[PDB]
Write a protein that binds this ligand. Structure first.
Ligand SMILES: *[C@@H]1O[C@H](CO)[C@@H](O)[C@H](O)[C@H]1NC(C)=O
Ligand SMILES: *[C@@H]1O[C@H](CO)[C@@H](O)[C@H](O)[C@H]1NC(C)=O
Ligand SMILES: *[C@@H]1O[C@H](CO)[C@@H](O)[C@H](O)[C@H]1NC(C)=O
Ligand SMILES: *[C@@H]1O[C@H](CO)[C@H](O)[C@H](O)[C@H]1NC(C)=O
Ligand SMILES: *[C@@H]1O[C@H](CO)[C@H](O)[C@H](O)[C@H]1NC(C)=O
Ligand SMILES: *[C@@H]1O[C@H](CO)[C@H](O)[C@H](O)[C@H]1NC(C)=O
Ligand SMILES: *[C@@H]1O[C@H](CO)[C@H](O)[C@H](O)[C@H]1NC(C)=O
Ligand SMILES: [Ca+2]
Ligand SMILES: [Ca+2]
Ligand SMILES: [Ca+2]
Ligand SMILES: [Ca+2]
Ligand SMILES: [Ca+2]
Ligand SMILES: [Ca+2]
Ligand SMILES: [Ca+2]
Lengths: 83, 83, 191
């Protein structure tokens, strides 16, 4: 959590998650990039004993993000008061 | 060095128009392991969760009901490691 | 007053410095500091037939308690008496445990009360992954809740209001930047 108080493992193991680099999140799923799989992979936010492949690459994939409105919710900007 | 690699370095693609190829029946010693891209890697490195030969073939089949190579060392839930 | 962003809050309405939050001490009267700092463990609370021991307040399934291997933080599970089942008028069932046995209500979403002599329905909404966003109690049941931008499906999951454009994925594969659809069927190159 934001305060570091409750800690949960989503997946572990050399065969399942050998070398992850980047991670992104949306709804039920997390998308992460792995250099050993040379892949972009999809997994379940709460527990996944067998992740799946979303895209397979010939080169190591580095960065991943999810593009959607609800990933960037609105809020007030204090700096609006004349910078 | 750019003469023959993954990249198309000139507008005509003349670097990658033609290239040499591997001489068949080349040798990797029995002390070592062979990768699908025709490269040789030490057997101790193979299932270390890290991409030692860049096609990912060393990490291709770990924990298919198998065990670590006899010289390796094992971590109960995680991976086989070099001596 | 409320806590600042550099502080932590406790169920009793108490404010604590953020560094104390996971330092290994019960600075919070409710023990909320160290609630889950150990990976995948739970402190001072139990799933329906788990049992907790005085050493560090960590809860473990009863079957393993007297199995012959120390599962408790202090090994207190390894002893294994029965005497208290004779003393107790508890309503369901007994197990051979250190400290003279233990009594537990039926496994199906019920658990012991203020003493083993009494029982109540289980804390659903305490299960990890029981709902995508928020959970509420109901009479013999539980209910999901999703925030304003989401709509509730399959009784467990939250999906995004169609008012918003279809979600996309943007990822890099070394040399190129690629855009794709959440179903993973189509991919294009953005740069
Ligand atoms: C954020 O505000 C803009 C401007 O009113 C609106 O178009 C957009 O839908 C809002 N998004 C959310 C998630 O509230
Ligand atoms: C314990 O007893 C108090 C007083 O009757 C009551 O308010 C509380 O809900 C009880 N707690 C449990 C878990 O039974
Ligand atoms: C979807 O969003 C629109 C605009 O906010 C709202 O009027 C509508 O009720 C929402 N639908 C659902 C099912 O939440
Ligand atoms: C290069 O490799 C190809 C197979 O991909 C052929 O075997 C060809 O004969 C090779 N060329 C040389 C000169 O060895
Ligand atoms: C060389 O490689 C071939 C396979 O390509 C054989 O394994 C052979 O035994 C190797 N060693 C020698 C000395 O030829
Ligand atoms: C793992 O151990 C078993 C015996 O339990 C077999 O010897 C098997 O061949 C071993 N696997 C590897 C890769 O050495
Ligand atoms: C507590 O929260 C209120 C808003 O509800 C104010 O932000 C107040 O400043 C906060 N207290 C502290 C100590 O920052
Ligand atoms: Ca080239
Ligand atoms: Ca290595
Ligand atoms: Ca390796
Ligand atoms: Ca690794
Ligand atoms: Ca302290
Ligand atoms: Ca503390
Ligand atoms: Ca035990």
């Amino acid at each position: 959590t934001y305060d570091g108080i409750q800690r949960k493992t989503v997946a572990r193991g050399g065969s399942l998650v050998p070398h992850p680099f980047g991670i992104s999140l949306f709804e039920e799923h997390v998308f992460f990039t792995d250099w050993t799989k040379m892949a972009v992979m999809k997994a379940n936010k709460f527990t996944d004993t067998n992740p799946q492949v979303y895209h397979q690459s010939s080169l190591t994939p580095f960065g991943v993000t999810v593009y959607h409105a609800l990933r960037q919710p609105n809020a007030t900007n204090p700096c609006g008061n004349n910078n | 060095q750019w003469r023959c690699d993954k990249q198309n370095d000139c507008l005509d693609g003349s670097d990658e128009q033609n290239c040499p190829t591997r001489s068949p029946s080349s040798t990797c010693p029995p002390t070592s392991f062979t990768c699908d891209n025709h490269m040789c890697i030490p057997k101790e490195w193979v299932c270390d969760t890290d991409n030692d030969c860049s096609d990912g073939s060393d990490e291709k089949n770990c924990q298919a009901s198998g065990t670590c190579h006899p010289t390796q060392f094992r971590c109960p839930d995680h991976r086989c490691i070099s001596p | 007053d409320t806590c600042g962003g550099h502080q932590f809050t406790c169920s009793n309405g108490q404010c604590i410095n953020q560094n104390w939050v996971c330092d290994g001490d019960d600075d919070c009267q409710d023990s909320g500091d160290e609630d889950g700092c150990e990976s995948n463990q739970r402190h001072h609370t139990c799933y329906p037939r788990e049992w907790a021991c005085p050493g560090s307040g960590r809860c473990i399934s009863m079957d393993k308690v007297c199995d012959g291997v120390p599962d408790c933080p202090e090994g207190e599970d390894e002893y294994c008496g029965t005497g208290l089942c004779s003393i107790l008028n508890c309503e369901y069932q007994c197990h051979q445990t250190p400290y003279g046995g233990e009594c537990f209500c039926p496994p199906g979403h019920i658990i012991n009360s203020n003493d083993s002599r009494t029982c109540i329905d289980f804390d659903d909404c305490q299960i990890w992954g029981i709902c995508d966003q928020k959970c509420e109690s109901r009479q013999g049941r539980h209910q999901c809740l999703c925030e304003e931008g989401y709509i509730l499906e399959r009784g467990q999951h939250c999906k995004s209001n169609d008012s918003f454009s279809a979600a996309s994925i943007i990822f890099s594969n070394g040399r190129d930047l690629l855009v794709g659809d959440l179903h993973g069927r189509n991919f294009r190159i953005l740069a």
